From a paper:
[name]-1 is derived from a metagenomic library from deep-sea sediments that predate the antibiotic era. [name]-1 has both MBL and tRNase Z activities and is considered to be the evolutionary origin of B3 MBLs. The zinc ion in the first MBS (Zn1) is coordinated by the residues His91, His93, His188, and Asp210; the zinc ion in the second MBS (Zn2), by Asp95, His96, His279, and Asp210.
His91 and His93 coordinate the zinc ion at Zn1, whereas His96 and His279 coordinate that at Zn2. The residues His93, Aps95, His279, and Asp210 occupy equatorial positions along the enzyme’s surface. In the structures of all [name]-1 variants, except in that of H96A, the electron density corresponding to the catalytic water remains despite the complete or partial loss of a zinc ion. Each MBS of [name]-1 is formed by four metal-coordinating residues, and the substitution of only one of these residues dramatically reduces the metal binding affinity of the enzyme.
Numbering used by the authors:
A (entry chain C), B (entry chain D), C (entry chain A), D (entry chain B): 2 to 373
Write the structure that this text describes.
Amino acid sequence: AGGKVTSSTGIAPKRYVYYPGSEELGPDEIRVIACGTGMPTARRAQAAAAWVVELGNGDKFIVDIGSGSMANIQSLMIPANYLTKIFLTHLATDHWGDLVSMWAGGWTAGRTDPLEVWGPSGSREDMGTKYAVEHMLKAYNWDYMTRAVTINPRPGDINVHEFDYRALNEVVYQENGVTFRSWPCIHAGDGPVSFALEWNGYKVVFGGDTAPNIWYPEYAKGADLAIHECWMTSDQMMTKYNQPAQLALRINLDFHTSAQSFGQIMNMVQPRHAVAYHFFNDDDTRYDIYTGVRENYAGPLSMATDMMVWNITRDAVTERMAVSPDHAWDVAGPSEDLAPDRNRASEYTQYILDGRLNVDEANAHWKQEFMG
Amino acid sequence: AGGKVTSSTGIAPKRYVYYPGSEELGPDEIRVIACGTGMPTARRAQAAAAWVVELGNGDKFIVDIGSGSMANIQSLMIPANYLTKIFLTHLATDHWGDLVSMWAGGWTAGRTDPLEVWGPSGSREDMGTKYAVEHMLKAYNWDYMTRAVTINPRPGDINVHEFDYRALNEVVYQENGVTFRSWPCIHAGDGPVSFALEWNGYKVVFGGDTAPNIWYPEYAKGADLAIHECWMTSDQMMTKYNQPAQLALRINLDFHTSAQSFGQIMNMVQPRHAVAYHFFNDDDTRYDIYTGVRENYAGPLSMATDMMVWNITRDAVTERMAVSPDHAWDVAGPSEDLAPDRNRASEYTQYILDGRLNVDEANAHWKQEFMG
Amino acid sequence: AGGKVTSSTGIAPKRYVYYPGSEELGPDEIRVIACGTGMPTARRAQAAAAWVVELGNGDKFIVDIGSGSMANIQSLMIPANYLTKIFLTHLATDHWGDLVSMWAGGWTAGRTDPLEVWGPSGSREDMGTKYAVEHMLKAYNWDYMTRAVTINPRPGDINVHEFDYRALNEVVYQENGVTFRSWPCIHAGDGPVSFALEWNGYKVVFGGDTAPNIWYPEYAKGADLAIHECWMTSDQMMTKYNQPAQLALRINLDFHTSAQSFGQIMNMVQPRHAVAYHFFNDDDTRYDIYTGVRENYAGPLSMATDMMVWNITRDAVTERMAVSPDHAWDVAGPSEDLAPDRNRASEYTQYILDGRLNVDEANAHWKQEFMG
Amino acid sequence: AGGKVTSSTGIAPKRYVYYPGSEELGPDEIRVIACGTGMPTARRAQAAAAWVVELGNGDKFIVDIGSGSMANIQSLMIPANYLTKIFLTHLATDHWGDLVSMWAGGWTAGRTDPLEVWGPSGSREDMGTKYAVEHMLKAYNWDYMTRAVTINPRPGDINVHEFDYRALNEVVYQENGVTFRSWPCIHAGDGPVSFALEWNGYKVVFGGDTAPNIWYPEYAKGADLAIHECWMTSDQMMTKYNQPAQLALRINLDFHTSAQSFGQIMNMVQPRHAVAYHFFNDDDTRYDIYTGVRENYAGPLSMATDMMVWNITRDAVTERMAVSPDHAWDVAGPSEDLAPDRNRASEYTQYILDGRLNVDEANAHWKQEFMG
Ligand SMILES: [Zn+2]
Ligand SMILES: [Zn+2]
Ligand SMILES: [Zn+2]
Ligand SMILES: [Zn+2]
C-alpha cells in the first residue's frame, strides 16, 4: 500500500494513512477530516459531529464542533490561530458542545485572534445563534474574567455572524474566493441548515442533521464530497434501545434520514464521493446501514468514523484514516506579542490570598538546581 | 495477577483490572473512578477533570465534569438516573464543560429526574455557579425547547445549590448519611473550592485546583483518599511550552502546586492514599513529577490517569485500571418515565415542513419486510 | 443496550460487551473468541488466525495459534492449565507461529501439563505436523534446556497427535463427549484441513484456509457456527498491492475463496450463524467484502475481527466484542507444585559464572527493608 | 510542543511524536525504535524484546525479534528488503520467536534477498544459533515448500553468521563503516550476549538479558544509548506472581538485574542516555522500578515501552513516542523482478485438486463487471 519508497534515508511517499502535520497541502487541493461522527450519547470511539476543512489557499474552517471533538481537532498539529472560523449547522449540544473547549483551550494554546462563528437564526431571537453564543459567554464568565487578568482578553471574544436559516441556497460567508451557502433542514424545529463550501472549482457539502428534504438533493448536486446523516436501522433501534416496533419504524421515516433515504438522496446528487455519518459505527451496526444505502446509490461512498480523512484533487477523492497522537499537545504558529492589560482588576480578594501555604523548605532543593 | 481461578466455567475473582458493570459494591465500600485527569488543552488520552464516586449505600456523585469526560462516564454502564448529583470545584471549562453533555445526553439516555448541581459562588453574582448554569441553559435554549415539545420537560431542569466559596469546611450537602464540606482554594480568582465527602467513617477529598494553601492540609487530614493538583515541572514547561526560565519558575511557585509542594501537603495530611492529578501523564513527564512528590511524601501514592479506579475498604485502598468500552452505549435502569401534564408549542413552521422529500419507493422494500 | 440494571450497588446484567473472566459459562452454552483473524502480513489490529473455544462441560480448545495471537489469548484471564489442547488446520506461520509463545510463556507462568497438539500429515513425512513440532522443539533447544534447569521439565513437552489429512470427515479426537472431525482443504499444497467440533447437540466448524471445495459444504451442514476464509476483493488487491488485473482476478477465482463463493458455500451449509475471516478488516475494505457475501447468502453473518465473541445457546447465536486488558498478566488456576529436577546439569559454565558483578552495596537498602 | 509552524499549507516541523515513514534521516543521525519491551508472557501493550536501528548511511538492523514484535516492525512503513539483517542476543522465545514472521511475512511483503542472521553459539552445537535456525526452517518446511513452488526461493534463504559467545568485545560484523561487537551475559545458561553497534562516532549498546556482570560496565562505557534489562521489584513478584518472599528475593539478586543494579551499572557506564527495558510498564509497576534506578543513577533515562523512539544526534539524545498504524500494510521499495531458473515440483496431489467446488454462477456478475 502507499507510494513506492525510493530511499532508505527518505520518506514513505503518498502514505496509506494520514499523519496530521506531516503533509504539505497543494494549492488546488482540499483536506477534510471527520473530527466527530457520533450522537448526543458519548463514547470514546466517536465524538459528536465535527469537521475540519483545509483549503490549498491556506484558509481552514471548522464545520460543527460537537461534544468531545476537540480532543480529535487538537491531535491535528494545527496552530490555534489557524482555526478561528467556525460554522454551526445547528444549536444541538452534539454540534457545538465543544465550542467552549476551542474558546478556552485555544486561548491557553496562544490564540491571539477572537473566534468567528457563523450559525443560523431561529424563528425568534432566543432560538438563534447570536443569542446562544451571547449566553455561552455569560455561562463561562468566571473563566473569561479570571483568564483576562493574566492573558490579553482580545482572543476571548467570539464574534457571531448570524444568517437567515430560511434562505434557499444563499451565501452566508464570502472572503478570499471562498463561499459558504446554506439551505434549510427539517430537524426538531426551525433553525438547522446544511452548508455548501465553494472554492477553486470545488464544492463540499456539510449536511448537518435532517429528515429527507427537497433542498439538499437540488443544492448539493455535483458536490466533490457530500456529507449527510444516515441513521441506524429500525431493527437496530429495537435491539439497542428496546424500542417498540412502530416507534423504531417512525425514527427512520419521520425524524431521521434512513440508510435507504440517504441512498436515494445521493443517487439524486451524483457527488464525486458521498459520506454517511451520525450513526454508531460498530461491528454489529455498520453492514446493514451500508446495505441500506446500496439499495439506491452505487457511487463512491465512505461510512464515516472519527479521524477519517478525504483528499480532494482534480483527479481523485481519496479516503484514508488519520493516525494521530492520543497524548496531544498544542503546537505554536505565528502570532502577535499580545501583552496583558495591566488596567484590569485582580479577581482575588486578600481573604483568599491570605491562605497561601509556606512551601519554601520543600521547593528549595529543585529551585536552587533549576535557577543555576 | 488477580485472584486465583477455581473453575473453568466460573469467573476470574478479584480481577487485576476493573471491568465497569461487572462488580457489586459492598455496603462498607467506596469506588472512585478518575473520568478525567487532564488540562484545559484537549487530548484523547486525558479528558479534563472528572471523578465518579460510588458509595456502598447506592448513592453516586460526580465531582467535576470537564470537557471530554462524558465519553469515560458513559463507558461505566451506569444508568443515567443514578448520575444526577454533580459537585463543581470551580467554573473553569476543564471542570464543568461537559455538564451540557450530561444534561442533553443523559436526557437522551433516559434520565427522568432533574440534574442537581452544587457549586461555589464567586465574589459577585456573575462569577458564581447559579449565574453560570442559568446562562448555560439559555445558551442551549434551541436544544431545550425543541427536545421539550411533546415530552415531560422535568429531566431538562437543573436545580442549582450555590454555596459561599469563603466558608471554612462548612457542610454544603447532608443527605442519607452523606456529607460534603467545602473550603477555599487559591486559583485564578476567588471562587474555587475543595470538597471533603464523609460517609460511614470514610473521608474522600477532591482538591480541585489550588496553589498551596493552609486550608487543605488541615481539613483533608486523615482522608482515606486525598486528591490534589500536581503540576508538570518548570523544565517541562520550558521543553513543552517554550516558556522563559523565569515564568516557568513562577508557574510552580505562585500559580500551581509543584510536585514538591504536593508532597509537603500529603506528608501534612497523612492520608491512607494520595492521588496526584492535573498533569499530562506521558512517558517523558511522569517520572520527574513522581520524583518531586517523593522528595517530601513516602506514603501510598497514585499518579492519576484516565480510568484509574480506587476501591476503599476498612483494610485497604487498592488502585486498578478500568477496562471499559470505547464503543459505549447507554444502559437502562428502573424506568420511572412520566407523561407530559401540559401542552407546549411546536417549534416548526409550515415553511420548513413543506420541504419533506417523498422517499416512499426507496423505503418500500425494508418497510414491507420489517412490518412482517 | 445490554440487560436492564436493577440496583445501583449491583451488576449490569447480560452486558453489551464481553469482559473476559467476568461471565460464568452455562452447561448448555459454547463461547468462541476470535483471537486472530488476519494474514501472514503483521498488524496490531489483527493477529494471525486463532480461535478459543470454551464448552459448558469445562473443556477448552485452541484452534490455530497464528503469529501475534497469544497477546489476545492472554487477555482472556484463562489459566494456562485450562488451554493445553491445540488443533492446527495447517502449518502456515499465520496458523501456528505463536505455538512457541504459548509453550514458553505458560511454562514460566506455572502450566504443569505438556501441550497437546493435533494437526494434519502431508504428502510425505517432512510436510506434516509430527515433523514440524519435532523440529520446532529442536529449534528452541536452548530455551528448553535452560528453562528445564530451574522449572520442572514435564510442562516443557509437546505431545503431537498427527492425523491423516486426506480423511473425509473422520474422527481425530473423541474424549468426554467432545468429537473433532477433519476433512481436506485446497490451499497452497496438500495437508491443510477444516475441523468440526461436536458436543452436546452443537456443531462448530473451523474452516481454516481453502479455495472453494466440495467437502466443506457437505460436512459443515447445519453448524451452529461456521467459520470460512473470505478474501479481499480483486479491486482491493489492485489498489493495495498494485497487482495487474489478470493476477488480481486469479486471486479470487483460483487461490482463495471470494466473498461471493463464501456466500454460495454458506447458502449450501445453512448454519445458524456464519463467520467470514482472514481479510484485513479496514474502513475501505470491509463493506465490499460483506456486499459480495450478501449476493448469495442472506442468513446471520459476522465479519470477524480480533476479539469478536460468539455465545452459542439453544435459543440464539449472539455476536459481541470483547473488551479486554492490553496490559495483560497471567491469571493463576489449579496447578501442581513441582520441584525442578536437581539431577539435570546446569547449562552455565564456570567461564560465564566467573563474570558476576558485586552489586551488594547497591542492593543492601531495599534488601534490608524487604527482609523485614 | 514540537517545532514552530510557519505555514498553514506546510508541515509541523520537529514534531513532538514520531510518525514512521514521515521523517528523512540525516547523515550524522541514528533512530532507534523499541518494537518490543516486554516479557515471555504476551500482552497487546508490550511485544517481546525487539529493536530497529536506522543509520544515516542507509543501513538498518533489527536487534532481537521476540514474539509479537512484527506488528510493531510492520507499522514503520519500511520496505522488507531494507530489514534483512537481524542480530539475536540469545535464543529465548521472547528474543527471536517472530523471526519466522519476518521470514514468511517479509517474503509476502516482497523481500527479494535472503535474511541474514547473526547470533551466538552455545557451549555445544545444539545450544547455538546455527542449529536453532536450521531447525526453525525445518519446522516450517510445509510453508516454505508450498510458498516456493512457482517463485524464486532466494528470499526464503536464511544465511546464519554464528559467532563465539565467549569472545570478550570482539567484532562479529564489520561492513560499510558499521561495526558490531559482542560480549557475554549471565542469563539462564551459556550463550547470551550483549552487542555494541559503532558507526560515525556513535555507540549504541543492546544489552539483551543478563544478571549484573563485569563485562557490560567496561565494554558499554560512554555509549550514546545504553539499553539494559531492568527487572520488576521483589514486592511486585509477590503481588503479581504470588511468589514466596525467599524466591521473590532471589529473582532480583541471582537471576535478573534489579532496578538498583541497573542504576549501579549505568553510573559505571556514564552513557549519554540509559534505557531500562524488560519489565511490564504499568501504572502500578513503573514508579517503584524508576525509584530503584534513581538510588544509584542520576543521568538521562528512558523507561522503555513499545514504540518508544530515540533520535541520536551530535547535540542530543531525544526520546519520543512513535504514532503508527494499527491497520498496517506492507510498503513497496525498489525491487528485482527475480525469475527462477530451477524447477520445483507441485505440492498438490490430483486427489486434493479434484475437490474443487464449481462457483462460476455465484462469481459471474462481479467477474464480468470487473473485466471491463
Ligand atoms: Zn446531530
Ligand atoms: Zn483545572
Ligand atoms: Zn491463513
Ligand atoms: Zn528476555
